[PDB]
């Protein structure tokens, strides 16, 4: 079973690079795409760029790619980097498993599939705030 | 005079397609090209798009 | 953000707020302040293994049918929110989770 623990920094200092983390327990790596979550406080779930078991990281268009994420092997373990961070972006961070789906509603042969992603397992969540 | 025009497609966007079975279609296919042969010299008879 | 009532110990149906441009295959998740969110129901059609069957929503067949999210009476879990994630055809991913909507029950 996933003990989905994240690694809580706690305080950061603005315009620093950041190190949130989660943890993932005795679960297969590249079993399913790899997600996070942030909710900023008043403020809808808001879902951040995914990264694929390929090594190739989705971004948010708004957040202009500042965040750089790469999955390390030995520690079973999502790194964050986010660079040049705000009090506004700062806050609450969950880790995620997205299970890639795919919708076909004609001709495979023409291309009419998407791939929907579907949230298996969701972050216990981190609360991090600018120092 | 009112000329209609295409506005807009409600629902997914498909592409337009003819859907002829395999099997069918290379077994007359075949046919056509031994009729071929026979008008051609016993040549070997190449269908290209 | 507009939460909407719940009768008490009925059963009611929650539709999306966003509306499909095509055939769509929504995610269904509850989230659950201070631990991790539930998913409810994925491609609008089964319940995910370990999910009650309270939850459940409409099939796509057809165009013209709106998804909608079924919940079992009032409780502790149903007063938290949950989020409707519209996939469609025509939009593409689905950056954006969309507006939340919230169970509430008093007396
Ligand atoms: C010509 O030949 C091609 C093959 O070369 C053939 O292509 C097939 O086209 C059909 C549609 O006519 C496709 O069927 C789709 O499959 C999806 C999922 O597999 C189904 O969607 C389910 O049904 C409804 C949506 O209408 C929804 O309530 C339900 O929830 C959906 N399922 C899920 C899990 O969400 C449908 O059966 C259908 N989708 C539609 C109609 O939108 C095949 O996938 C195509 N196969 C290939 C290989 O491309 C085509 O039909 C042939 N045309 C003729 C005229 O003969
Ligand atoms: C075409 O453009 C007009 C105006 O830019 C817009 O109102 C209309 O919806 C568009 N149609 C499509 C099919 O995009
Ligand atoms: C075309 O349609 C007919 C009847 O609708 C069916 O019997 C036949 O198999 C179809 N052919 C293909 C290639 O789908």
């Known amino acids: 079973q996933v003990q989905l623990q994240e690694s809580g920094p706690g305080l950061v200092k603005p315009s620093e690079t950041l190190s949130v983390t989660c943890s993932v327990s005795?679960?297969?790596?590249?079993?399913?795409?790899w997600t996070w979550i942030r909710q900023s406080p008043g403020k809808g779930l808001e879902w951040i760029g995914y990264?694929?078991?390929?090594?190739?990281?989705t971004y948010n268009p708004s957040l202009n790619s500042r965040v750089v994420i790469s999955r390390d092997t030995s520690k079973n373990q999502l790194s964050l980097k986010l660079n040049s961070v705000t009090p506004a972006d700062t806050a609450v961070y969950y880790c995620?498993?997205?299970?890639?789906?795919?919708?076909?509603?004609?001709?495979?042969?023409?291309?009419?599939?998407?791939?929907?992603?579907?949230?298996?397992?969701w972050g216990k969540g981190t609360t991090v705030t600018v120092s | 005079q009112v000329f209609y025009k295409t506005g807009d497609i409600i629902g997914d966007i498909r592409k337009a397609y003819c859907n002829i079975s395999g099997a069918q279609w290379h077994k007359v296919l075949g046919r056509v090209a031994n009729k071929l042969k026979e008008h051609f010299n016993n040549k070997t008879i190449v269908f290209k798009p | 953000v507009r939460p909407l009532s719940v009768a008490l110990g009925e059963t009611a149906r929650i539709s999306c707020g966003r509306q499909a441009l095509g055939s769509r295959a929504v995610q269904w998740y509850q989230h659950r302040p201070g631990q991790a969110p539930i998913l409810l129901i994925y491609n609008n059609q089964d319940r995910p293994s370990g999910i009650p069957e309270r939850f459940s929503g409409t099939p796509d067949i057809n165009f013209g049918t709106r998804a909608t999210l079924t919940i079992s009476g009032v409780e502790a879990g149903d007063e938290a929110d949950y989020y409707c994630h519209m996939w469609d055809s025509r939009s593409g991913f689905s950056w954006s989770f969309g507006g939340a909507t919230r169970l509430t029950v008093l007396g």
């Open positions: 995620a498993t997205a299970r890639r789906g795919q919708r076909i509603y004609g001709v495979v042969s023409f291309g009419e599939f998407f791939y929907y992603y579907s949230m298996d397992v």
């Open positions: 990264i694929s078991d390929r090594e190739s990281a």
């Open positions: 005795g679960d297969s790596m590249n079993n399913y795409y």
